[PDB]
């Protein structure tokens, strides 16, 4: 059982383009992109927790990591989209 992000990227693609397929090499590229962005944001949040003498990682560290790594307007929409999920889960 080899772990990947296959079906989640596929359902995101079906959300944004219900009649468009995807190839295996493009799927591997998308998987590498998701892993790379997850690694960058998690490493930045770990550094943010380390500089502030905090032993925990919360939504504030991930939010500051998104605001630092993602450039410009992409950050502020991503920051918007995430706060919403945490809100839903907390109510949920």
């Amino acid at each position: 059982r080899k772990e990947s992000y296959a079906i989640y990227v596929y359902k995101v693609l079906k959300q944004v383009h219900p009649d468009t397929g995807i190839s295996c090499k493009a799927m591997s590229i998308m998987n590498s992109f998701v892993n790379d962005v997850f690694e960058r944001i998690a490493g930045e949040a770990s550094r943010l927790a380390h500089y502030n003498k905090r032993s925990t990682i919360t939504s504030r560290e991930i939010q500051t990591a998104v605001r630092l790594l993602l450039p410009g307007e992409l950050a502020k929409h991503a920051v918007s989209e995430g706060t919403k999920a945490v809100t839903k889960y907390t109510s949920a």
């Binding site: 930045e44 550094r47 500089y51 500051t64 605001r67 630092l68």
Partner: protein
Amino acid sequence: AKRHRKVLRDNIQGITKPAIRRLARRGGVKRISGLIYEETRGVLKVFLENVIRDAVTYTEHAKRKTVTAMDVVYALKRQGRTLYGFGG
């Protein structure tokens, strides 16, 4: 009319012409054209706003109003312009 504003906006012209000439003399430049200084001011403004934006983000992660030197060190470190002499 003695009316003027408190906030000054021409501080990018505060980086004067002989300061940019001294910078180019340290860079080993013999002759300088007259259009160099505005381009240098724009480049300095872009670099400064990038570093200061990252430092302000680092400061407001810590819930602070004061930009410390360590935040500037981290902001320079993330972009790959690591600076020695202030980390400790």
